[PDB]
Each structure stands twice: as structure tokens, then as C-alpha cells.
């Protein structure tokens, strides 16, 4: 009696589901080659000055003491270093087709933006490298203005007060962005929830899977079944388990979007 991946594909294709909310995480970053920095066994914590525990890289107190570890990751992730993958372009096609209500990302690689999805459709829940702020005088800076420093392994200093200029990444204990709270209007309005490439381990993001209406399908495309969905399953849940890219590729096939995907990707490659 359960819904199938194909059932969900047909609802989308028929515009029966046309207000899709999407939640994404690191599983869509790793196909682009992004370091698996959410994994403590990432070769990143082999590079990394002297870091007491992985999470310190996004702790303000540690950052003020020693911002070099964070800036090593910043250099790694800075705009232009990585290209969006087929998962990102799938989401861009969903937008293009008039089906994307909102995409909530826990990622900081900016690949959703780079795929061409407009900012109106994005909730960058953990911030962005596109902009930075001085930690002392609060002066805002475009990310290009600290690029040369970041790429030269220099800690960027404010020209006004010599405070450290910190990319607009959300650190532990900081307010989530204002746009996060769009969830209170978006999730109740969604007619489909897609959960792509997230272990749903980082709270409070993981708990949003419960905020869709009880009748709305929730489709998980992920290597493994994730607790929030599984602990409290609903009758219209669907799980496409396996490599996230192969899962999206299956969905694109069922949707009939293979050619439109090729056209899009071909059109977008020049820009990068």
C-alpha cells in the first residue's frame, strides 16, 4: 500500500505536487568533491593549527583564540573551488519547472546558488561565504574583498579596526539566519517534502521533517534511513536508499527529465 518513487515522480510530473520543499545536506556536497568535514574521520582533521575537537572549527570562542583552522576550511570551500553536481541541477530544474517552493540547505559550499537557483528560493541555514562581517566593528564585506587574504592563508583584517573579518557562516550558539524561520510558513504549505543527502543529525534542522502536514509525502533520497523519518514514520513516506546521485538519476529518469537535465547542464557549464 506504500507510495513508490514512481508514484511520487508521477505526482510531480502531473503537478499534483507543485509546492515542493527540499532539505539538503552534505550527501549532495560530497559528489562535487567537497571535504566531508561533518565526518570526524575526514582527512580534514588530519590537516588540522591544533584543534581540540572537530566542532571547535565553528565555535566563536575558539575562533577568536585561533581562527586559522576555520580559514583553512574557508580556503578549501571558497567560491570557485567546486562545481555543482547533478543533484544541484536536479533542484535547479525543479525550480525552472515552477515546482520549488523552497530549498533549505545545511551546506556552506554555496553550490545551490552557483547552480542558478535564485536567492528567493534558498534558505542557507548555516550561512554563506558570499559575504563577511568584521567581528569587532560589524562592518559588512563582499566575500571577494577578503579573497586574496583567504587564498594566501592570511587571516583577513578589518581596514577600520583590525578586527578579524569572519565569513558569514553561522557558528554554534549564534542565531540561525532570519530566513530559517520561513519554515513556519513553508513546511505547512508544502505538498511534497524531499530530503536529499542529509543524515538529519544536526538539530534543529533535522526536526523540520515533522512540520509538513500529515497527508504530505516525504521522500528521502539518502544512503541510509534517517531517524527523524524512521522514528515517527507516516503513511506516505518513501525511501530511495543508496548513493544519492544514483537515486536522483533514477528520479530524473522516472520524471522524464533526462534531456532537459542535459540541456540545463550544457547551458550552465560555460559559466564555471
Amino acid at each position: 500500500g506504500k507510495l513508490s518513487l514512481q508514484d511520487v515522480a508521477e505526482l510531480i510530473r502531473a503537478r499534483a505536487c507543485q509546492r515542493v520543499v527540499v532539505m539538503v545536506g552534505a550527501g549532495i556536497s560530497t559528489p562535487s568533491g567537497i571535504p566531508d568535514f561533518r565526518s570526524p574521520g575526514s582527512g580534514l582533521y588530519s590537516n588540522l593549527y591544533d584543534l581540540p575537537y572537530p566542532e571547535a572549527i565553528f565555535e566563536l570562542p575558539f575562533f577568536f583564540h585561533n581562527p586559522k583552522p576555520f580559514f583553512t576550511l574557508a580556503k578549501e570551500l571558497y567560491p570557485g573551488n567546486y562545481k555543482p553536481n547533478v543533484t544541484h541541477y536536479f533542484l535547479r530544474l525543479l525550480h525552472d519547472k515552477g515546482l520549488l517552493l523552497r530549498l533549505y540547505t545545511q551546506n556552506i559550499d554555496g553550490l545551490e546558488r552557483v547552480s542558478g537557483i535564485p536567492a528567493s528560493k534558498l534558505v542557507e541555514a548555516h550561512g554563506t561565504f558570499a559575504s563577511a562581517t568584521c567581528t569587532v566593528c560589524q562592518r559588512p564585506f563582499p566575500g571577494e574583498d577578503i579573497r586574496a587574504d583567504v587564498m594566501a592563508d592570511r587571516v583577513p583584517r578589518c581596514p577600520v579596526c583590525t578586527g578579524v573579518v569572519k565569513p558569514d557562516i553561522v557558528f554554534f550558539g549564534e542565531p540561525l539566519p532570519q530566513r530559517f524561520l520561513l519554515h513556519v510558513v513553508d513546511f505547512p504549505m508544502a505538498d511534497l517534502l524531499l530530503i536529499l543527502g542529509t543524515s538529519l543529525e544536526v538539530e534543529p534542522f533535522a526536526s523540520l521533517t515533522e512540520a509538513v502536514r500529515s497527508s504530505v509525502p516525504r521522500l528521502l533520497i539518502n544512503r541510509d534511513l534517517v531517524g527523524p523519518l524512521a522514528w515517527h514514520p507516516r503513511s506516505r513516506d518513501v525511501a530511495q536508499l543508496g548513493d544519492v546521485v544514483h537515486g536522483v538519476e533514477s528520479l530524473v529518469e522516472l520524471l522524464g527529465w533526462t534531456e532537459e537535465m542535459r540541456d540545463l547542464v550544457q547551458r550552465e557549464t560555460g559559466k564555471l
Partner: peptide, 5 residues
């Protein structure tokens, strides 16, 4: 506003 996590 709610805190990261």
C-alpha cells in the same frame, strides 16, 4: 532566534 547545534 533559535540556535544552531
Amino acid at each position: 532566534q533559535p540556535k544552531k547545534x
